[PDB]
Design a protein around this nucleic acid. Structure first.
Ligand code: MG
Ligand code: MG
Ligand code: MG
Ligand code: MG
Ligand code: MG
Ligand code: MG
Ligand code: MG
Ligand code: MG
Ligand code: MG
Ligand code: MG
Ligand code: MG
Ligand code: MG
Ligand code: MG
Ligand code: MG
Ligand code: MG
Ligand code: MG
Ligand code: MG
Ligand code: MG
Ligand code: MG
Ligand code: MG
Ligand code: MG
Ligand code: MG
Ligand code: MG
Ligand code: MG
Ligand code: MG
Ligand code: MG
Ligand code: MG
Ligand code: MG
Ligand code: MG
Ligand code: MG
Ligand code: MG
Ligand code: MG
Ligand code: MG
Ligand code: MG
Ligand code: MG
Ligand code: MG
Ligand code: MG
Ligand code: MG
Ligand code: MG
Ligand code: MG
Ligand code: MG
Ligand code: MG
Ligand code: MG
Ligand code: MG
Ligand code: MG
Ligand code: MG
Ligand code: MG
Ligand code: MG
Ligand code: MG
Ligand code: MG
Ligand code: MG
Ligand code: MG
Ligand code: MG
Ligand code: MG
Ligand code: MG
Ligand code: MG
Ligand code: MG
Ligand code: MG
Ligand code: MG
Ligand code: MG
Ligand code: MG
Ligand code: MG
Ligand code: MG
Ligand code: MG
Ligand code: MG
Ligand code: MG
Ligand code: MG
Ligand code: MG
Lengths: 119, 70, 97, 155
RNA sequence: GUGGGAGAGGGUGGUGGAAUUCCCGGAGUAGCGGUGAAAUGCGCAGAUACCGGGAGGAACGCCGAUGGCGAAGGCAGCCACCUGGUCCACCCGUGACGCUGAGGCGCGAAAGCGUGGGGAGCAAACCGGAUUAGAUACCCGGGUAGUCCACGCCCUAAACGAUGCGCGCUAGGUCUCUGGGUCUCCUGGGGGCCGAAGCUAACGCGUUAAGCGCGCCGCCUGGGGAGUACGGCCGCAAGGC
RNA sequence: CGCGGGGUGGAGCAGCCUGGUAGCUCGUCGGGCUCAUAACCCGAAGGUCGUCGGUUCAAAUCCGGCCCCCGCAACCA
RNA sequence: GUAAAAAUGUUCAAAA
């Protein structure tokens, strides 16, 4: 319900889908979007094109609250991650900074099987 | 490229307190770098890490921060 | 009805003239190997004579393939001339004739 | 084919308007190797053009063809599983070939009677940007974009 | 004996951050999830994504390796304590005290068993969704023993280098870990590749032998039946010999 | 039997929260097209909105008679 | 480090 100049935008792209959520100087959401939000569904969400429209529709909404300079944090290896960053920069928003903070266990709890496959 | 071992004189690689001295072996995200980029030997790279870790425990050396700009 | 065995695990070819199942029975070669039979069954192209019979020894029965395509046409009792089956879609004898 | 890039056969320019683009159209109009009745009808149509259309029955042809050119088309592509029909750009001479074909078919699909009248009317409409083979182009393009997501499948 | 060396060797105690899940709080809205594509599933009772706080368990990313250690199984964040084996230098001590080893004794992955505790993630069994002719599977969504700790059993394995241990002798070349030193190299222990002579059925082995010899243990004698039956022994049982 | 919530494409079925908007999947038809099948993909028939009536340039909307199926406190000699 | 999905059927000799 506020309107901040500088903000933040998160990228989450799992091989199944890509979600982008725009926050503020603290990380408290302003709006978001992703594959399904756009109009796509199912497999056609992990798709890069999907990611594109998303990041756009994402910031496209952010405009309402007046967003301009916003860092960027990426999480994933999505078969459609770049388009997110791109579509962002190429928007009425200035990609004030791009960082990659994809979580990663320092070898902790056993993973599933589709992943444990590495041993 | 620039070998880490080079850029420094006679240092006590078992000095778990010399920030920069050690601070200059952690890739760009904290990853304790390989000999292929530090240039130490077997017995060195070893005693190095052992000490590099010690420093990480004391808030001196980081654990990881993911380099900026991607 | 059924088999009539004693110490033998296979039915012997009853040679003809006893086989009153079909007309004109007419003897023939020994061409098409046994189901690991030591050889080659007894055939009797026979009524028409554009028709062939090879013998089921385990079975007790002789089975009819056509003269032309060479397609299993039945199994019938040597005793009567009443068939015992359906035509098996899955075997051909004319590669042995 | 497997060896080389085939052979881009060349056309013998029109013998009344002269042009390697007005000739191909006469190939399609042609049935059973009758280059005769082919060309013939093409002009009988141009005549009807003049009739009402006080415009050059040469640009009314160039324009039409232009309005019916598939910018991008959707071509199938079996993937690691089910099959997907990928959207791609149509070769320049591929756009022509098709642009023409549909015109011919879209022509015979009309309720007219004299093949000339048909090949005539269609070309008018096709030039106006709203005909039968036109719908086809407006449509074949709709396919693309619709499957725009499968863009990362360009071969 | 003396003086030093390297190491994930073993046991006890303690400690760090990454991450997963659950709870709490804030912000925010129409989907998330998942596959070959889906569906079941979760979500307007506000999930996914993000931020902050807390609990709890398990494993230790980069270093890290054709790497090291141990008799084997097997061993990996960091820290201290208790403790084993081993390598080099010095030629100082004893003076054949050595090798092997039926039986016996100890150890012995994972799974499994008992008593008690712990339980985040994963996951036999089990329930769903898809696939299929079927699908008591593969793939997906759930999910309990178990995995984790203590004490006591179990005692098997492709427990594999499929190569018993010890001593001597028979070209080197190359790279690697660790020592000693009169540091383009000499010298000792160990880990690899290519390879003399030689052995070999060939494949390949070759100073780490499957080479050349001696000492001692173990085992083989056609495939199947069968590692079964019976007897005996051990085990809570499953089972093991 | 009394309040008072809605009927819509054959069916599932949003607007009425502040009056011009004929919404979409599945299903039906052709196609795209695949191994069959299937998600998908594009065009498309498929709603006088029960209707006598007030309201307006335009009424499904402001709203009256209750026509009917669901909900339906309770009552029932 | 990752091609979804597709089961199954037949049986002899020639050279010196
Ligand atoms: Mg997906
Ligand atoms: Mg280390
Ligand atoms: Mg057989
Ligand atoms: Mg140690
Ligand atoms: Mg401990
Ligand atoms: Mg510990
Ligand atoms: Mg945590
Ligand atoms: Mg749970
Ligand atoms: Mg909450
Ligand atoms: Mg539900
Ligand atoms: Mg609601
Ligand atoms: Mg609500
Ligand atoms: Mg954080
Ligand atoms: Mg948190
Ligand atoms: Mg050994
Ligand atoms: Mg091993
Ligand atoms: Mg020690
Ligand atoms: Mg020691
Ligand atoms: Mg010396
Ligand atoms: Mg001495
Ligand atoms: Mg001496
Ligand atoms: Mg001496
Ligand atoms: Mg003395
Ligand atoms: Mg003496
Ligand atoms: Mg003496
Ligand atoms: Mg014991
Ligand atoms: Mg054990
Ligand atoms: Mg265990
Ligand atoms: Mg237990
Ligand atoms: Mg019990
Ligand atoms: Mg228990
Ligand atoms: Mg639990
Ligand atoms: Mg519990
Ligand atoms: Mg699970
Ligand atoms: Mg399947
Ligand atoms: Mg199947
Ligand atoms: Mg099947
Ligand atoms: Mg199958
Ligand atoms: Mg599962
Ligand atoms: Mg599971
Ligand atoms: Mg059980
Ligand atoms: Mg049990
Ligand atoms: Mg237990
Ligand atoms: Mg044994
Ligand atoms: Mg021995
Ligand atoms: Mg040295
Ligand atoms: Mg050596
Ligand atoms: Mg060596
Ligand atoms: Mg030789
Ligand atoms: Mg030799
Ligand atoms: Mg060799
Ligand atoms: Mg050697
Ligand atoms: Mg050697
Ligand atoms: Mg070796
Ligand atoms: Mg024995
Ligand atoms: Mg025997
Ligand atoms: Mg025997
Ligand atoms: Mg056994
Ligand atoms: Mg017994
Ligand atoms: Mg007993
Ligand atoms: Mg028990
Ligand atoms: Mg027994
Ligand atoms: Mg698959
Ligand atoms: Mg099948
Ligand atoms: Mg079968
Ligand atoms: Mg069968
Ligand atoms: Mg066979
Ligand atoms: Mg001779």
């Amino acid at each position: 319900k506020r309107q901040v100049a500088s903000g933040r935008a998160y990228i989450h792209a799992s091989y199944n889908n890509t979600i982008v959520t725009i926050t503020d100087p603290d990380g408290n959401p302003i709006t978001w979007s992703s594959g399904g939000v756009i109009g796509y569904k199912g497999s056609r969400k992990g798709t890069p094109y999907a990611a594109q429209l998303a990041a756009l529709d994402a910031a496209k909404k952010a405009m309402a609250y007046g967003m301009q300079s916003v860092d960027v944090i990426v999480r994933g290896t999505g078969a459609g991650r770049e388009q997110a960053i791109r579509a962002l920069q190429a928007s009425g928003l200035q990609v004030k900074s791009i960082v990659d903070d994809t979580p990663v266990p320092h070898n902790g709890c056993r993973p599933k099987k589709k992943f444990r496959k590495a041993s | 490229k620039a070998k880490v071992k080079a850029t420094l004189g006679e240092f006590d690689l078992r000095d778990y307190r010399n920030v920069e001295v050690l601070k200059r072996f952690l890739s760009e995200t904290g990853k304790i770098l390989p000999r292929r980029r530090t240039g130490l030997s077997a017995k060195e790279q070893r005693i190095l890490a052992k000490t590099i870790k010690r420093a990480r425990i004391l808030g001196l050396l980081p654990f990881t921060e993911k380099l900026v700009r991607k | 009805k059924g088999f009539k065995d004693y110490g033998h695990d296979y039915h012997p070819a009853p040679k003809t003239e006893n086989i009153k199942g079909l007309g004109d029975l007419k003897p023939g070669i020994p061409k098409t190997p046994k189901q690991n039979g030591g050889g080659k069954r007894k055939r009797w192209t026979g009524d028409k004579g554009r028709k062939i019979y090879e013998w089921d020894s385990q079975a007790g029965e002789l089975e009819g393939y056509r003269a032309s395509d060479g397609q299993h046409l039945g199994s019938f009792d040597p005793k009567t001339g009443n068939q015992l089956k359906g035509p098996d879609p899955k075997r051909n004898i004319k590669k042995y004739l | 084919a497997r060896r080389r890039r085939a052979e881009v056969r060349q056309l013998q320019p029109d013998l009344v308007y002269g042009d390697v683009l007005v000739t191909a159209f006469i190939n399609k109009i042609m049935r059973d190797g009758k280059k005769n009745l082919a060309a013939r009808i093409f002009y009988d149509a141009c005549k009807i053009i003049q009739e009402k259309t006080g415009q050059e029955p040469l640009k009314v042809f160039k324009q039409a063809v232009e309005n019916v050119k598939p910018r991008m088309e959707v071509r199938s592509r079996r993937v690691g599983g089910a099959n997907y029909q990928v959207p791609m750009e149509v070769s320049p001479r591929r756009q022509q070939s098709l642009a023409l074909r549909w015109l011919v078919q879209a022509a015979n699909q009309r309720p007219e009677r004299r093949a000339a009248v048909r090949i005539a009317h269609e070309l008018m409409d096709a030039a106006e940007g709203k005909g039968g083979a036109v719908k086809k182009k407006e449509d074949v393009e709709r396919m693309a974009e619709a499957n725009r997501a499968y863009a990362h499948y360009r071969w």
